[PDB]
Amino acid sequence: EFPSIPLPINGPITNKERSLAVKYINFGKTVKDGPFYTGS
Amino acid sequence: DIEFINSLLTIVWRFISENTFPNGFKNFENGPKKNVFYAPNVKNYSTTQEILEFITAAQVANVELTPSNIRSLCEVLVYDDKLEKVTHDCYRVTLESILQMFNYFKMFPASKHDKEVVYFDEW
Amino acid sequence: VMTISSLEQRTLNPDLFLYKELVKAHLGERAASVIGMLVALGRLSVRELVEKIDGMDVDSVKTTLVSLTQLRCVKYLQETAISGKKTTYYYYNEEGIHILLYSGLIIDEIITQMRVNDEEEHKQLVAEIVQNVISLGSLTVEDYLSSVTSDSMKYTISSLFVQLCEMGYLIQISKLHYTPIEDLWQFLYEKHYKNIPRNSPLSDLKKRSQAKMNAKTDFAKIINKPNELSQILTVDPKTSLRIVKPTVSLTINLDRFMKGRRSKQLINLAKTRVGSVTAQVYKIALRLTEQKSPKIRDPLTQTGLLQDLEEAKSFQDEAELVEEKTPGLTFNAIDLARHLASLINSHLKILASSNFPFLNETKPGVYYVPYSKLMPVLKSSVYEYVIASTLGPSAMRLSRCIRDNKLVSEKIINSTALMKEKDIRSTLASLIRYNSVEIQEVPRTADRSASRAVFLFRCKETHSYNFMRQNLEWNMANLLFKKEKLKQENSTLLKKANRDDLLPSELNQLKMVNERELNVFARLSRLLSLWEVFQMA
């Protein structure tokens, strides 16, 4: 793209905390399957 | 300008780091800095004309005998990137000694999709 | 043309696109429609939402307000007029949206908070009830225990339930937190002003001392009732085990969680200037003084303050008196920070002499942490390390030497540490665009030109802290919008992955997008840990 400029880092690849995002997506799915959703 | 400024900064930072902290306990973590200074004593000092003595111990062969103006200039140079300069001119290298060897930022970057740049193109 | 670099959300939506994207991934699409009108307009009633949505009716608006009240995302405010016709009013609630924002970082700290009983109870006892409190809102005990059948181990939840509300998070439900901040002060500003009879003027007002000091008095027990309270706690039945009252429902508190979250930035400052073991004993001395701390800014001066300079001067002085006069937080003695001898006292003296403003102000020998005199140093020590990490260390040395004096001139930077006109004046233009230089010119002419003028470089605060805060908020809004865009290529893959709970191209499709869906949360947690410092005073 138009930007390629020096190092916006604090974005590496080594997670070490994969279960934390599992807790994130588990909370997301439990709010997704709640009694109230108010979709569409 | 431009290399001898970095040379003088390197040697005065090395002298501060070897003056206010021991030598052989920086590159490893075996009871660090002798459990630093063995629950530190009342020593807690700095150079106070000793840094100009370490200057005088090794110089270039030219007009670089500076003191009392470039001394304060390098002092201001070392309290806007490093040493805090509390009274008694006390100097501690605790973060620059780690940066010379915010942590654990390895394995960067990727050649792929989003963040992994999120910079200008403003966001 | 070819807008693929996401330019179409540049100049349409800061500071509300975050609030719309946090609720679109959690509460459907109809709640985003009303929360995009509560933020964009202000206070508006039910029918004012109906005549503004153009696509929902009273059957649709009132259905969604219950789902937003359950997650305390909408503040109630019932009011009336001078002629009558009492109606209902609604604000947008940012604390509930922050509860939806973190939502797993809450169950990150609450797991690593208990003692020796480790990895036999923090998998299904507490981790299944705390996420149910965060997900379903206000919960009681009797409606939760009906979900289990043949409750043999029915008192195992009670021991972890009395322990959790003993030191914080669990709290009595929002009988006060749905009422807004400003009307709680404005109704109190009037109901102790209209009962004073006619008397002497005495410089024609005088009650703008008396009554509002009275207001301050009965502000103090309004906030203090949602805290550690003896109405729900210390209930002792006869010939039985100690228990709390299970009848009333209870929720979580986002007031002790934030002061427990500030401790991580305090430890990150403690990595500077001292080692690891001394940082560990400062860590445990900080964790012992969590739940009694003065919190991030009280609602006393959040709104209603019309900038009375005597009151604004004396508010930061009386907070020092709150900090000095505690019921036990100042008692950071030897017998309190070694169990929960002289060597740790020497390390604590090094903490006193570390010269960052923590663990200072100690006359008799018992130590205290100055929370109020630390916050500019906390907000500035992390602000410098972002220009250094992203833009450059030379720009960090420059932006520190703008503040090393006040209003540095032109020919003063190039006297220090670097030559002239090579990248000194080049990184200034890379820092005017981030509200971190704030140029100010003075001419000698009569029409304020730029040729016959000189430049003055003063680092004006509270403009660099807010622009980076809005930048971090809009990066967070960017990160969740792209995540819900790649979900559209999985509506025919993840919904269809329910009838069984090999086509190896799906190994590069299903099990390839999963870590692509994980590494956005993995850095959203770091965005959260980097953004919090600009909203803790």
Q: Decide the pairing of beta strands C439-443 and C453-457.
A: antiparallel
Q: Does B30 touch chain C (CB under 8 A)?
A: no
Tokens of C216: 């301050």
Neighbours, chain A (3 or more CB pairs < 8 A): B, C
Cβ distance C419 to B95 less than 8 Å, yes or no, reads: no
Q: Does B118 touch chain A (CB under 8 A)?
A: yes
Considering only CB atoms, which chain B residues are within 8 Å of C471? 123
Considering only CB atoms, which chain C residues are within 8 Å of A22? 518
Radius of gyration for the alpha carbons in chain C, expressed in angstroms and rounded: 27
* Residues whose CB is less than 8 angstroms from the CB of residue C369 and which lie 6 or more positions away in sequence, other chains included: C286, C289, C332, C358, C359
Option in C26, C522, C530 nearest A28 (CB): C26
Nearest residue on chain A to C389, alpha-carbon basis: A9
How far, CA to CA in Å, does C59 sit from each of A38, C49, C56, C181? 12, 12, 8, 29
What residues of C are in the B interface, CB distance below 8 Å? 5, 7, 10, 271-278, 342-343, 346-347, 350, 353, 355, 385, 389-390, 393, 396-397, 400-401, 404, 415-417, 419, 471, 474-475, 478-479, 482, 516, 520, 523
Nearest residue on chain B to A1, alpha-carbon basis: B121
How far, CA to CA in Å, does C173 sit from each of A39, C127, C139, C226, C252? 27, 20, 9, 8, 8
* C-alpha closest to that of B118 among A12, A9, C431: A9
Distance, CA of C25 to CA of C41 (rounded, Å): 23
Nearest residue on chain A to B103, alpha-carbon basis: A10
How far, CA to CA in Å, does C217 sit from each of B112, C12, C300, C307, C535? 58, 44, 11, 19, 27
Residue type, C82: I
Considering only CB atoms, which chain C residues are within 8 Å of A37? 27-28, 67
How far, CA to CA in Å, does C405 sit from each of C261, C398, C409? 33, 11, 10
What residues of A are in the C interface, CB distance below 8 Å? 1-2, 6-11, 13, 15, 17-18, 20-28, 30-32, 34, 36-40
Give the distance, in angstroms, between the CA of residue C316 and the centroid of all CA atoms in the same chain: 20
Task: Let me know: does C452 contact C443? Beta carbons within 8 Å.
Answer: yes
Considering only CB atoms, which chain C residues are within 8 Å of B40? 346, 350
Neighbours, chain C (3 or more CB pairs < 8 A): A, B
Distance, CA of B98 to CA of C5 (rounded, Å): 38
Tokens of B64: 């670089």
Q: How many beta-carbon pairs below 8 A join chains A and C?
A: 84
* C-alpha closest to that of C527 among B107, A17, B115: B115
Which DSSP symbol is given to C295?
P
Q: HEC string of chain B? A: CCHHHHHHHHHHHHHHHHHCCCCCCCCCCCCHHHHHHHCCCCCCCCCCCHHHHHHHCCCCCCCCCCCCCHHHHHHHHCCCCCCCCEHHHECCCCCHHHHHCCCCCCCCCCCCCCCCCCCCCCC
Distance, CA of A31 to CA of C110 (rounded, Å): 20
Q: Is C396 left (phi over 0), alpha (psi -120 to 50) or beta?
A: alpha
For C457, phi then psi, to 5°, come to -115, 95
Residue A34 burial (C-beta neighbours within 10 Å; 0-12, 13-18, 19+)? middle
Considering only CB atoms, which chain B residues are within 8 Å of A14? 106-107
> How far is the alpha carbon of A9 from chain C, nearest alpha carbon, in Å?
6
Distance, CA of C45 to CA of B86 (rounded, Å): 58
Cβ distance B106 to A9 less than 8 Å, yes or no, reads: no
Cα four-point dihedral sign B15, B42, C265, C466? negative
Cβ distance A1 to B108 less than 8 Å, yes or no, reads: no
Cβ distance A31 to C519 less than 8 Å, yes or no, reads: no
Distance, CA of C387 to CA of C397 (rounded, Å): 10
Resolution of the solved structure (Å):
3.3
Distance, CA of C100 to CA of C97 (rounded, Å): 5
Task: Let me know: does C427 contact C394? Beta carbons within 8 Å.
Answer: yes
Tokens of C321: 């008196």
> What is the CB neighbour count within 10 angstroms for residue C442?
9
Which DSSP symbol is given to C19?
H
Give the end-to-end CA distance of chain C in Å, rounded to a whole number. 43
* Residues whose CB is less than 8 angstroms from the CB of residue C463 and which lie 6 or more positions away in sequence, other chains included: C435, C438
Distance, CA of C167 to CA of C146 (rounded, Å): 27
Considering only CB atoms, which chain C residues are within 8 Å of A13? 519
Which DSSP symbol is given to A38?
-
Nearest residue on chain B to C273, alpha-carbon basis: B94
Distance, CA of C514 to CA of C498 (rounded, Å): 16
Distance, CA of C513 to CA of C497 (rounded, Å): 14
Strands (E), C350-503: 439-443, 453-457
Distance, CA of B90 to CA of B105 (rounded, Å): 30
* C-alpha closest to that of C64 among C46, C85, C84, C41: C46
Distance, CA of B41 to CA of C347 (rounded, Å): 10
Task: Report angle CA A27, C99, C54 to the nearest 5 degrees.
Answer: 90
Q: Does A3 touch chain B (CB under 8 A)?
A: yes
Distance, CA of C434 to CA of C78 (rounded, Å): 42
Tokens of C213: 């000091």
- Stated as kind and residue range, the H or E segment containing C342 is helix C342-352
Q: Is C234 left (phi over 0), alpha (psi -120 to 50) or beta?
A: left
Distance, CA of C109 to CA of C126 (rounded, Å): 12
Which DSSP symbol is given to C104?
S
Cβ distance A4 to B117 less than 8 Å, yes or no, reads: yes
Experimental technique, in short, is cryo-EM
Task: Let me know: does C40 contact C55? Beta carbons within 8 Å.
Answer: no
* Residues whose CB is less than 8 angstroms from the CB of residue B86 and which lie 6 or more positions away in sequence, other chains included: C355
Which DSSP symbol is given to C88?
E
Residue to substitute from C135, C433, C483, interface A, most A β-carbons within 10 A:
C135
- Stated as kind and residue range, the H or E segment containing C92 is strand C87-92
Distance, CA of C487 to CA of C497 (rounded, Å): 14
